[PDB]
From a paper:
Non-ribosomal peptide synthetases are important enzymes for the assembly of complex peptide natural products. Within these multi-modular assembly lines, condensation domains perform the central function of chain assembly, typically by forming a peptide bond between two peptidyl carrier protein (PCP)-bound substrates. To address this, we report the structure and biochemical characterization of complexes of a PCP domain bearing a stable analog of the acyl acceptor complexed to the acceptor site of a C domain from the NRPS that biosynthesizes fuscachelin in the thermophile Thermobifida fusca. The C3 domain of the didomain resembles other members of its class, comprising a pseudo-dimer of CAT domains with bridge (R2923 to T2944) and floor loop (A2843 to L2858) regions.
To verify the role of the R2577 in controlling access to the catalytic channel, we generated the Arg to Gly mutant (R2577G) of the C3 domain. To control the modification state of the PCP2 domain, the mutant PCP2-C3 didomain construct was expressed in the entD mutant of E. coli. Similar to the wild-type construct, the protein expressed well and crystallized in the same conditions. The structure of the R2577G mutant is very similar to that of the wild-type protein, with the PCP2 domain sitting at the acceptor site of the C3 domain (RMSD (all atoms) 1.2 Å compared to wild type). The first noticeable difference is a small rotation of the PCP domain in relation to the C domain and slight alterations in the PCP interacting regions of the C domain, likely attributable to the R2577G mutation allowing the first helix of the C domain to sit deeper in the acceptor channel. The major difference, however, is the positioning of the PPant moiety, which now fully extends thought the acceptor channel into the active site in a similar way to that seen in the ObiF1, SrfA-C, and AB3403 structures. This observation supports the hypothesis that R2577 acts to control substrate access to the active site of the C domain. Firstly, we confirmed that the R2577G mutant C domain retained activity (with Gly), although this was reduced compared to the wild-type C domain (32%), possibly due to the loss of stabilizing interactions with the PPant arm. Whilst this residue is largely conserved in LCL domains, it is typically Gly or other small residues in DCL domains, which we have confirmed allows the unmodified PPant into the C-domain active site.
Author numbering: 2481 to 2552, 2557 to 2999
Write the structure that this text describes.
Amino acid sequence: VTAYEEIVCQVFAAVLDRSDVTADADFFALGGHSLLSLRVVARLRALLGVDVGVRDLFEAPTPAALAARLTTRPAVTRRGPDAPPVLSHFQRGLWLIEQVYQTRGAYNVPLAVHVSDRLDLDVLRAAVRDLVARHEVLRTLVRSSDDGPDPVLLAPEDAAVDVAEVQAAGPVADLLAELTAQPFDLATQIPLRVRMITGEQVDGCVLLLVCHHIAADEWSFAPLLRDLDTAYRARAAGRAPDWEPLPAQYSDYAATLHDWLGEATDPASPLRRQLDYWQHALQDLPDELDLPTDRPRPATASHRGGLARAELPPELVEAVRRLAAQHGVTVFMVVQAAVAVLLHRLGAGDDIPLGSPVADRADEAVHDTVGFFLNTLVLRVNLSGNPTFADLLDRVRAVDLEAFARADAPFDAVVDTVKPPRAVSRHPLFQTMVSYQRRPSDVDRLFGAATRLVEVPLDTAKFDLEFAFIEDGHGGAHIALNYAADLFDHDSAEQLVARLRTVLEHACADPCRPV
Ligand SMILES: *P(=O)(O)OCC(C)(C)[C@@H](O)C(=O)NCCC(=O)NCCS
């Protein structure tokens, strides 16, 4: 759970009166001392509701280390040569949504970088090979058996990488979306595909990485670009990249997680314990919410979608951060509360279940590596009683901290335990997702050129609605709404995401007004 790390950063920043607090900055090196350590502990106890002590801060003086400590489950260890691949339960759920609900390429994740230079295709191909050699998860196939899916780790010399140039014919943003949507056959193809887009209207090139989600979450963007940059620069100079072996492969992480999780039939295992919480917490859940769609739910889901964006003025982004600090919540919690208000005002009622991904990256061996570490949680917020926005923030905090203490039970096991009525055109337990994302910083000079990330207007959709508050890595932010085209017209989606901005604006202006 990254939320613990954000709060520790937030408390460090307020106590130290510093705005340059990063997850690996040492409290005392930043100007902390015993007197201020009392304030850090008191604030953390007040915001997290757990027993925090000076001993924790002394022994774990960085936000990443302290967040891992307050949570902690065994550390991830390398299993060594010829340890067999292990498919994680999170990977299992992704393979399974796609097999069962036939999501086409909706779970492909794009990473697009405009480059001022056209890159060398043969050098790029060599660098992708190095990248795949480094990260086993990028060359692990998934094959169907009659027990479930089996991983198949390809040796680096047997991994056939797919790197190609594509001439742009029309608007590049549409082409990026179409390339992103092409489905993978994970039984025969590695889950990474690379395209360099060139054309008359393109100055330089657009480098597009398409991963299947089974191999990467959005926190993988930073190591992916970092390692690809290193391999490209080395191969352009005629040599193999000079890197240090990974502290762990994804299979090392998966093996540790599964051994800690235990079995569902063991009443003392963390899995059964967290499953029992979720069975209680999701009792009498709505099958779906009463959303203002342009069309009723079809019998068959097409997974077509669009993407509507709402730009946020810098002033509003700071007001949202200020509101979060002032009420002792994360930016995600504010956005979550705002989405709940929006849906509530549109007639969805007082019981609002919102899905949200949660990253399992606290362990230092995987904190900054490539892979899919997201579990999905149902955050059930209640809006009965005419609460103010400040009231709702307290409610959302409590709901989220309870859920975060129980974030290892795989979502597919939660759905199985809760046993909702199933329908191929409705995602179970929730149909609106909310997340916070933050794009990599210092990715403006990759490959020896001038570079910048470009967002991709997805042609697909996973749910009815997916809201994302996305920070761009250099101060800016926008809200992205990935909506199901079966339910919403694009102009309705533009209105919805503008309304979410209005809720946020009203909330910062006066949090004491009633929802
Ligand atoms: P933190 O580790 O920054 O704490 C500093 C301290 C309070 C431990 C230290 O500055 C301090 O005052 N230690 C006590 C010194 C002492 O007991 N001498 C008194 C002679 S009776």
